[PDB]
Amino acid sequence: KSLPADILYEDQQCLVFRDVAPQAPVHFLVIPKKPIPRISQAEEEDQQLLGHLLLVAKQTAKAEGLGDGYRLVINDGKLGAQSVYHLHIHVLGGRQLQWPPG
Amino acid sequence: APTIFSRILDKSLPADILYEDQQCLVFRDVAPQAPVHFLVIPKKPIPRISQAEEEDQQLLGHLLLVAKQTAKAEGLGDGYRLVINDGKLGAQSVYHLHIHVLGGRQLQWPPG
């Protein structure tokens, strides 16, 4: 019922795949394999995992040719416009991002 | 290369500080884009997320946990957004790594 996501990267801790509704020419998603539902529900034990996700995001941004710049976004809850209750880090690039960020 | 955040860190220029420990400082944005808008910055002067390294793994995780904890303390219980800008296309203007935390209104999509 959906298209198969291009998985850009995977390791023992996380998965990186393209957003089916891209908000920029490059828009991908970094998710942990541990199903943390929302960033507001991350805990101290997740510290290394969270750092790893950000490192994977910036490494994948380099790989995707986002050297002129990009934006990382994490949405929490209703007011953050979170839609899937598993942690997703958005990486957006390939165009000039605006301010404010929504 | 020091940025204006160096004057925030050394307390020479004023800031509304929400949290501080030996690894980071959290303070309100002076041009807030939401009713609550603050910045979480490392004391280590990493200039941008694209220049973070494997050695920074723990620090990066700490910054996200501090962002999350400060969001709770600021009453953002119905949602919020974390944003990191890198480079010109990301609209980065201050070249000292920071996480924006925005809440207190419905954030829109796309995020800029």
Ligand SMILES: Nc1ncnc2c1ncn2[C@@H]1O[C@H](COP(=O)(O)O)[C@@H](O)[C@H]1O
């Ligand atoms: N079938 C799908 N394949 C790839 N991405 C999806 C799919 N369904 C939803 N998404 C995206 O997953 C993201 C979830 O992030 P969030 O809205 O922050 O929870 C959104 O940007 C969606 O567009």
Ligand SMILES: Nc1ncnc2c1ncn2[C@@H]1O[C@H](COP(=O)(O)O)[C@@H](O)[C@H]1O
């Ligand atoms: N003296 C200051 N105190 C607090 N926030 C500041 C100060 N100078 C600049 N800023 C904010 O720093 C942010 C820089 O974010 P960016 O444009 O993502 O680099 C902007 O939101 C500015 O409003």
